[PDB]
């Protein structure tokens, strides 16, 4: 059975702030080491639980964080950015399930290093339903009828996952105290947690269903300021909701909605004076 | 008659982006020159219209922008920051009226360089009523029973002013096209506009009333992310509205509410990972 | 009569290389001074020839080059970037004609500082017809039934203009020797040329017709490398022509085609390893 | 039994100056290594003495110093800043006792790297009683009826501790010679000292009582200069004692007094020209 | 009659913050221009009032601020640092009186840019009497039986002067609002004030007496932290008052006390971790 893995960084265990996730900062090298090892715990247990294939997609920033020379040798790594489907690149209907690792809470909510794709977004909406990276990626997984079996990260990401995906297995490797502070488990302790949770998730997979997205989903993105909204509103097919900093885009399907998100946020990232 | 002047920079005529208002950028020196001259037009007409005193308060960033060696010699300049009442420092009940120059639109709305005090705030609220710098400063002016006779800036700031202060005179020195683009009048052209508008404002002053604030106003600040809300929520007497990034503070009066704004935004400014 | 002006920098007289057009380089300040004065010659002659209104749109880079304090006082300046229609922002059907100043040759062809919007594009296509900034802007002018009366820049931009717009008046303020070298006229000499040419263009306006664009134009952009094509191909409604670095976009009208160009090139600008 | 641990850096053994505690300096990496190991000695002995839980709160600067990958695996680490209760975050009435590690002397007194929270404070006062970080944290511990069983650091911090908390156990890992010089014990030697002292502290716990704070404590902060006092005096409910650089704040309880300290010092930190 | 002038910068008119007095900051060049001109007003009036000689001593920082090429040609300028008597270098018993220009309030008290010699000192004491630069320089003037006829600076410096020197003439060129903010008079307005005040001071000189210092003055310096006290306590003849950050030095005369101040503060300036 093929298992898909999307690994982010903010939710990795032990990491309290961006000095561990920003490639240009002092604790980054330690961060990617811990990140790679955290993924190995899940990969190891994935194979040990019957999986014959495990696709690992680096889903953070430049997505060149996971160390290819230290990742589980029997796993296939997708490294690099500018991928057609970013965080869910390589995920198709041939996968038995998906596993989100090192995830964090969506923007504007409690949770360590909370945000959604870029600092500029406050909320993502798929037909009026509030979602973050977790939600959007789950919806893309749904498009391929692939269920999100497990989600690991801080306690807030776990809560956010289970409130969206029924019976989903969550692994809270750390507890959020503030947006830049957490109470975490020792690397070895989190390893057991992840090992057990991954095992249970794979055997309890039948109780989890794909997060089916609407046929012609309406993507809504609320940005922090009006400037970011103007930038995104440059993309054809978009419109700004008067009296707000929200930009909407009527998509043909979830896949088009995802890519519209990529482009709109990319444009918003160029906003100055903020 | 004593006239009070609060001069910001983003709304100054001819200025399209922050390269003209950020002391650390290439067009700053030209910006403060134009800013000082813009204020002189109003000061000159103020005296010409009978005013015996004109207090000019630099209300932008470090508030050391207006050039003391080029400002109207008969005017009194307040230069420097860390002032008890920031943008409205020096304003008391002994003034006949107030004049806001170089103002801009509040955060989250259309208007060149739109924002409210710091990049981190999305909305300011005084008893559920949406306001930005313009609103808050008007309310403090109201506390001293001083009416805001005139408000100058872009077309968006003007609109925002008149929708808050009945019969207020506005002078749109430039038209907003985007958050970093405008269609402006020549320096001399804006001068005439400001001269005429200032004259009319002073003679039509009887038709404008002070923006009286509530007795025990409730200050509400919605921040861009949860991290900024946590910082502000550190201040005694504050509370975060569950499910939001808004922090509230019950004040004794408008003056305490203003300072609470200064402190809460100052704290929010320290937020990292954004 | 209302006259629209789009002013770029590379084609301004006397400027041989990017040290005069890059805001971060040594000769930039002299460059924008010459640029502002060059525009004044045309503006002055525009009014002298009957025009009652002259809208000047800064169309270079951050578009904050023209100096508002030195531009003709009777002209209206659009300064700043992130404008819905970039180089042709503010142009509607109420204008008698358009005047392109300081223009340069399109990418991949002879001409000083030749390029099209960004360094990454090799060619722009509107229904298989090769065009650069000059062509695209002319087509947008055509959408509003406004004719391009005059085009000033180097000899190559002039040649490019006349091969696209019949009877158009051109003013070659300098001769191209290489992509970073030119034989130019003295500032005063170019002034006369521009003055005479602007006068003739306004009186010979009847002989020039709007460059009418197709109803549902197909925008094609050929990028320098495949990476830039992949970035642009992220935008919904786009497709890469197999075996090429060209991305196509079927637009509803010229206006949508223009904005699609803005977004696609903006995305391409992010391409690394080039 | 649950044991709470607050670990600072200046008082850590072997560390003579700030090159070992400032994340931006040459000896920082060695410093945090020694710091983590120093904490492990206490944690190990804590468990060995019966404790079932040990909460470790990084209480220095950005509080991301203790190394999660090297800390005792059976301990729970709180890493990160912007915590509601900074140095005493996570401390409640469910703890048997508290242990302060790597502490230093309060500002304005003898002791290596002496200070109180920020360089700008000279003295902290809780109802006229002189206290520093040690005192304030003890008082917050008192609010939860939790006694400070042990305090480790230099000889000056130890003396300061015992003069405030009767029968408290102190461990002087180093002797102060100057504010940036000390006579220290070898890493292994300090380890034994800490091991023995921690054991004795836990078994002699009955002789130590919580430092009960006043019901409505009055916080007083004397700053180095008047500028820092003005900044803090911006916070609602504060007042400057005429003729001094001291700012007072009447709190509802010790918890509000602590946060008022956090905010007032945070504001004072912004003071320029010092 | 010979007149002595000591010119500092913080108290100069129009200057709100250190960006105007720190040679390494953006507004310094404007600052020293205003400073030189401010001194010229007094020099001009000094000569116009009968004075035959005017010695001008640059008394700020590196003391190379006053511009020799723009200072009154008939005045003698002392430029440079490391002078035996710093701020009062060149002052002897052959002078009719002294004039302090651009002075500021002493450390730890209200007043724009308040401090005493270095940021590290909180208070200076001459036989238990609180004094700052103003006081110490007046005492040195007293040693030579020279009276301080006039003192110019902000309102706080003026107040401090008159509370120390009976009948002294003060000129408040600006009003203090905060340590980095003031309400100032136009350069020309301050000029008249200084001109009038200088004239009155010279003709009312008989009513002012020299601030005679004790025979064997005891210098006391209270520093911000203990580290600065330790540094100064290195100088032979010094002692730290237990329980404080104050260092005392028994001098033979006011001249020795002054130089002891120079050395003690110079040593304190080396203090790290502050
Ligand atoms: Zn993420
Ligand atoms: Zn991430
Ligand atoms: Zn503003
Ligand atoms: Zn501003
Ligand atoms: Zn161009
Ligand atoms: Zn250009
Ligand atoms: Zn400490
Ligand atoms: Zn510390
Ligand atoms: Zn001084
Ligand atoms: Zn000075």
Swiss-Prot record, chains A, B, C, D, E:
In the induction comment, the record states: Nutrient deficiency conditions, which also induce sporulation.
Q: Which family does it belong to?
A: Belongs to the peptidase M55 family.
Q: Where does Zn(2+) 2 bind?
A: 8, 60, 104, 133
Its quaternary organisation is: Homodecamer. A 20 Angstroms wide channel runs through the complex, giving access to a central chamber holding the active sites.
Question: What Enzyme Commission number does this protein have?
Answer: 3.4.11.-
* pH and activity: Optimum pH is 9-11.
| Keywords linked to the UniProt accession | Aminopeptidase, Hydrolase, Metal-binding, Metalloprotease, Protease, Sporulation, Zinc
What organism is the protein native to? Bacillus subtilis (strain 168)
Q: Which cofactor does it need?
A: Zn(2+)
Q: Which residues are responsible for catalysis?
A: 115
Q: Could you say which enzyme class this protein belongs to?
A: hydrolase
Functional note: Hydrolyzes N-terminal residues in D-amino acid containing peptides. Among the tested substrates, the highest activities are with D-Ala-D-Ala and D-Ala-Gly-Gly. The physiological role is not clear.
What is an example of a GO molecular function annotated in this UniProt entry? aminopeptidase activity
UniProt binding sites for Zn(2+) 1: 8, 10
- Mention any Pfam family matching this sequence: Peptidase_M55
Question: Protein name, please?
Answer: D-aminopeptidase
Cofactor descriptive note? Binds 2 Zn(2+) ions per subunit.
Q: Protease: present as a keyword of the record? A: yes
GO aspect biological process, one term: sporulation resulting in formation of a cellular spore
């Amino acid at each position: 059975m093929k298992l898909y893995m999307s690994v982010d960084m903010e939710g990795i265990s032990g990491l309290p702030d961006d000095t561990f996730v920003d490639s240009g900062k002092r604790n980054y090298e330690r961060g990617r080491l811990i990140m790679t090892e955290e993924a190995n715990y899940c990969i190891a247990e994935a194979f040990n639980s019957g999986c014959t294939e495990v696709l690992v997609n680096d889903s953070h920033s430049k997505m060149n964080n996971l160390m290819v020379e230290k990742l589980h040798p029997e796993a296939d790594l997708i490294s690099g950015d500018v991928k057609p489907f970013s965080m869910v690149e390589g995920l198709d209907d041939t996968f038995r399930g998906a596993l989100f690792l090192g995830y964090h809470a969506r923007a504007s909510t409690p949770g360590v290093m909370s945000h959604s794709m870029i600092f500029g977004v406050r909320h993502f909406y798929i037909n009026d339903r509030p979602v973050g990276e977790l939600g959007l990626n789950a919806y893309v997984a749904g498009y391929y009828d692939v269920p999100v079996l497990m989600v690991a990260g801080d306690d807030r990401a776990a809560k956010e996952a289970e409130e969206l995906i029924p019976n989903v297995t969550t692994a809270a490797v750390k507890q959020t105290i503030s947006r830049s502070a957490v109470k975490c488990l020792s690397p070895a302790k989190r390893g057991r947690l992840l090992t057990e949770k991954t095992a249970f998730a794979l055997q309890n997979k039948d109780k989890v269903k794909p997060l089916t997205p609407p046929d012609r989903p309406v993507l809504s993105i609320e940005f922090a300021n009006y400037g970011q909204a103007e930038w995104a509103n440059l993309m054809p097919g978009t419109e700004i909701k008067t009296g707000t900093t929200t930009v909407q885009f009527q998509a043909k399907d979830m896949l088009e909605a995802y890519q519209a998100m990529l482009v709109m946020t990319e444009l918003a990232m160029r906003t100055s004076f903020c």
